[PDB]
Amino acid sequence: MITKTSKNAARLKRHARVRAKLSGTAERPRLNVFRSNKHIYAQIIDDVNGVTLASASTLDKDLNVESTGDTSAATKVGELVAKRAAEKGISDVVFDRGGYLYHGRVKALADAAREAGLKF
Amino acid sequence: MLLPKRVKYRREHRGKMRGRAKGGTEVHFGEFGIQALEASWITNRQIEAARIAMTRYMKRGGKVWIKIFPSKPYTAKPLEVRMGSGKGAPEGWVAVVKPGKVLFEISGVSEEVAREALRLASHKLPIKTKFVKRE
Amino acid sequence: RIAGVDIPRDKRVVISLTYIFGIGRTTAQQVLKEAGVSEDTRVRDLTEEELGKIRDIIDKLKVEGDLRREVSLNIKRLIEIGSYRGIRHRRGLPVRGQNSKNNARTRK
Amino acid sequence: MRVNITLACTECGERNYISKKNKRNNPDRVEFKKYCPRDKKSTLHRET
Amino acid sequence: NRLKEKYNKEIAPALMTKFNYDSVMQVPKIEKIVINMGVGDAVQNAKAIDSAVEELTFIAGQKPVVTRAKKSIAGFRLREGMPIGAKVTLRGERMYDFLDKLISVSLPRVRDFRGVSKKSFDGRGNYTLGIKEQLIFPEIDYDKVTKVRGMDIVIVTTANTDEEARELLTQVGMPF
Amino acid sequence: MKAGIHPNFKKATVKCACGNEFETGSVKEEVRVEICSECHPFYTGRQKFASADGRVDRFNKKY
RNA sequence: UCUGUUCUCAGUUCGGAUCGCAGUCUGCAACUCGACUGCGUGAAGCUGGAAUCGCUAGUAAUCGCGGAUCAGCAUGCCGCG
RNA sequence: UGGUGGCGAUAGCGAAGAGGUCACACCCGUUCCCAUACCGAACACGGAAGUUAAGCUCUUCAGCGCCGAUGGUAGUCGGGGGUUUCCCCCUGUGAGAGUAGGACGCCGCCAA
RNA sequence: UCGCCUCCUAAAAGGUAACGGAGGCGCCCAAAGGUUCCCUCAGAAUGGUUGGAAAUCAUUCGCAGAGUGUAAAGGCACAA
Numbered sequence: 076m077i078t079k080t081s082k083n084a085a086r087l088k089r090h091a092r093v094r095a096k097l098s099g100t101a102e103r104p105r106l107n108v109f110r111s112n113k114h115i116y117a118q119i120i121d122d123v124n125g126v127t128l129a130s131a132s133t134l135d136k137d138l139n140v141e142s143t144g145d146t147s148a149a150t151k152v153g154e155l156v157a158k159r160a161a162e163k164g165i166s167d168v169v170f171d172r173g174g175y176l177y178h179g180r181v182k183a184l185a186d187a188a189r190e191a192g193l194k195f
Numbered sequence: 196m197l198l199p200k201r202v203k204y205r206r207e208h209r210g211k212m213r214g215r216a217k218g219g220t221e222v223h224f225g226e227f228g229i230q231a232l233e234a235s236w237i238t239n240r241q242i243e244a245a246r247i248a249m250t251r252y253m254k255r256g257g258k259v260w261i262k263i264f265p266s267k268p269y270t271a272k273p274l275e276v277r278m279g280s281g282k283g284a285p286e287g288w289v290a291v292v293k294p295g296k297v298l299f300e301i302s303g304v305s306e307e308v309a310r311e312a313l314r315l316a317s318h319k320l321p322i323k324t325k326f327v328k329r330e
Numbered sequence: 331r332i333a334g335v336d337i338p339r340d341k342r343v344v345i346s347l348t349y350i351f352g353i354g355r356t357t358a359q360q361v362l363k364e365a366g367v368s369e370d371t372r373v374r375d376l377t378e379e380e381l382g383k384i385r386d387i388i389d390k391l392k393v394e395g396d397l398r399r400e401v402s403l404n405i406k407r408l409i410e411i412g413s414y415r416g417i418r419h420r421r422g423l424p425v426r427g428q429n430s431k432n433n434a435r436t437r438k
Numbered sequence: 439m440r441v442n443i444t445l446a447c448t449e450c451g452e453r454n455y456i457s458k459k460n461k462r463n464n465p466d467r468v469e470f471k472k473y474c475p476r477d478k479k480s481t482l483h484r485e486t
Numbered sequence: 487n488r489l490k491e492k493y494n495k496e497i498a499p500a501l502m503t504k505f506n507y508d509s510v511m512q513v514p515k516i517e518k519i520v521i522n523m524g525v526g527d528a529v530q531n532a533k534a535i536d537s538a539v540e541e542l543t544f545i546a547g548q549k550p551v552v553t554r555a556k557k558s559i560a561g562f563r564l565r566e567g568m569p570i571g572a573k574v575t576l577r578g579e580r581m582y583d584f585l586d587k588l589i590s591v592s593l594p595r596v597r598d599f600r601g602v603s604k605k606s607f608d609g610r611g612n613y614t615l616g617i618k619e620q621l622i623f624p625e626i627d628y629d630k631v632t633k634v635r636g637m638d639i640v641i642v643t644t645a646n647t648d649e650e651a652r653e654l655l656t657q658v659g660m661p662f
Numbered sequence: 663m664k665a666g667i668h669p670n671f672k673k674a675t676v677k678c679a680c681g682n683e684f685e686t687g688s689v690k691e692e693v694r695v696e697i698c699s700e701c702h703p704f705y706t707g708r709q710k711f712a713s714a715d716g717r718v719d720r721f722n723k724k725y
Numbered sequence: 726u727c728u729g730u731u732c733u734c735a736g737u738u739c740g741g742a743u744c745g746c747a748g749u750c751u752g753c754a755a756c757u758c759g760a761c762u763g764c765g766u767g768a769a770g771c772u773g774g775a776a777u778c779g780c781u782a783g784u785a786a787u788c789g790c791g792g793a794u795c796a797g798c799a800u801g802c803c804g805c806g
Numbered sequence: 807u808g809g810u811g812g813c814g815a816u817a818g819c820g821a822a823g824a825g826g827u828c829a830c831a832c833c834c835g836u837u838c839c840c841a842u843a844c845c846g847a848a849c850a851c852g853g854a855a856g857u858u859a860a861g862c863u864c865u866u867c868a869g870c871g872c873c874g875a876u877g878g879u880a881g882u883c884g885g886g887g888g889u890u891u892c893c894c895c896c897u898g899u900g901a902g903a904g905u906a907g908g909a910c911g912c913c914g915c916c917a918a
Numbered sequence: 919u920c921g922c923c924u925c926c927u928a929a930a931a932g933g934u935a936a937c938g939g940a941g942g943c944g945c946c947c948a949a950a951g952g953u954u955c956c957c958u959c960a961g962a963a964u965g966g967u968u969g970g971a972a973a974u975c976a977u978u979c980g981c982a983g984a985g986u987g988u989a990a991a992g993g994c995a996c997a998a
Contacts, residue, residue: 077977078977088957088996091958174956176955
């Protein structure tokens, strides 16, 4: 039983490290990502009251993507959270990676936000 | 001849004594103990003289059970010098003793011989002194 | 190579086989006479079948570490027997008996 | 052993800058990129 | 590949049904093999690192990593700087290729090998071999090779106790 | 997997003196084997040659 | 000594001492303490400072051969080529 | 059930027992993105054979650790005495592991 | 001994003397700065080489014993 370190512990460590200099306030919220190996989640968080303005996930009941976690599906769920902002217009947000490096599905999510015009 | 083999700072303040001892208020390790009533300084030579008195009178025992160790160094200037120009040289070591301090503990020796040994050695210390037995 | 240790390459086999432990010139002569290598052979030119059969005949003979452990076993047997001659090996003095004062200088 | 260096700008010739450097560790002539207030931009600066 | 299929097919189910594990996939498995040089001649000859960079690149298909002395020792004349030793780590299929090359040619090519002791573990189930010569395969340039020094092999498994690792390496084929 | 610094290896084959074939990857393509596991008697159950060499002098003077 | 092949300058096919195994002979008996043989092992030694020895018509140097004390034991000694 | 915040560890470290069809995570392969001075161990890319033992969530314990009052003392602001390298009395204040006990969780918002 | 820094004396804010008790400074760094990204040491136990209490490795424990350019004090492993 050689000790393999868990992914989530190191991810919470580096997520606290990136959280230490940014936190989504009122009218300046935080866009947070989870990149679990079957589904992709995005949230808009206000820090001072602990509320969620909008959120989006690949396990949603319409306009599903077959690959369920491809970067194409990440661009799709970026489009969905863009329409969630379109009902609830904030039109600016600070991106918060999970410590997930800015190359992957998080990069496709960010690029979907840029293409839809969500100001980072 | 009781010596701390290493000390951080070889010169330190004389200090002030007031109030009872923090610990050592009861004889716990032997069965007859001796207590201080008045607070003063007790030196290496006084500890050694009391131990020689006890051991040489009893000529037997479990052990002697000295309960204090001198850590405080005291300093003296050399004789006949104009006073000042720096603190003097360390001369010896002192165990600080507050009232209610057990000084020596005795186990395994009977009643009157223990009484005689503790009287004989308490006469060799500068402080007023009382016998005590373990509850 | 042959006994797990290397061989010289550009000399004759009846001499080159004496390099490996526990086997010698007369022994190499008498094994290679019946092996039929004509006593002048470079190892750069040979055949695998003759290499295999010399491999098994030097495998059957007492070559590689077994002579070392055999003489070690006999000499340690002599140590726990003691019996003078073991004391001579332990002290390093000459054993077969000689004038121990005059030369005695191959040992110690 | 550190020495004082004035740093003249490349094209204009106004120093505006001093620094400390070790001639044992850096025997070459140092090249920096520093703002020149006469030239109104960051310009390469020469060790004199 | 081949040892993956072999490992699964006649090591995993036999021992898991022998010792009645609660899940199949908690079977012990060899995790990696790490090779150490520890060559302390860099004070005397500092240029001897690329020496056996060549034949550790001959052993494994990827380059070794030069180790780093974490402090300075005066009695060994080791200042800080001038790094000592060389390490490499093998995992995946390259580790299984190393076990094939270690079993097939290397231990028979060792000409004094006897059955190793049972108590050669580190106490938890992770094994260390020491091999005193560079003689693994005959294209090691033994004829004009420079040094005759040794090699440290540490095989590391996920077996928590010693008995599981012992029976696993008997199923691999280590002679004891 | 940095290309250009790892030495290339091919799918190599392993040929024994007994004609055994085995597969590996190495710098070379085909490797000679002088002695192999199933040829060495130590692997093959009990030892064969040192079994004959394992005798001791059991005070055999009687001849 | 005279004709052929090899080694090609090396601690080597030099050199043979110590060591284990197995023997032959002599003798009541080869451990203390004999000689010799077959093996294997192969050591120091790459012509040696201060100084120092012998040698003038077979002389030095080499190569052997006998003999004497003695059951057996020469590199000692005597003699011969 | 997951994601995500606040509360001093009354939230911890451990000892036991369940769970996975949805999720989470193990696993599988490096074809290009990327990467390890060594590598798919991590960082990535894209799939889902089987797998709850671990990560995770629940039920229990005072083993360890943590929190912790009432009178009790030591110290002391302010008065007043004494044989004054220090003691004693007053209207007040009031310590610290030690015991009363608490506790191996309490509140939000989105997706089931 | 004469200037500057740090601790105690310094009497729970700040300040406070003595020829009182301990040290240090008259520099170093073109990275030993700035930013972006990623972790975790000191020590101990056990296995294996010339490897030796102690070169290098692998595993386990390890809230800080180690680091933090240099003296000390205050801070820091959500890194300083």
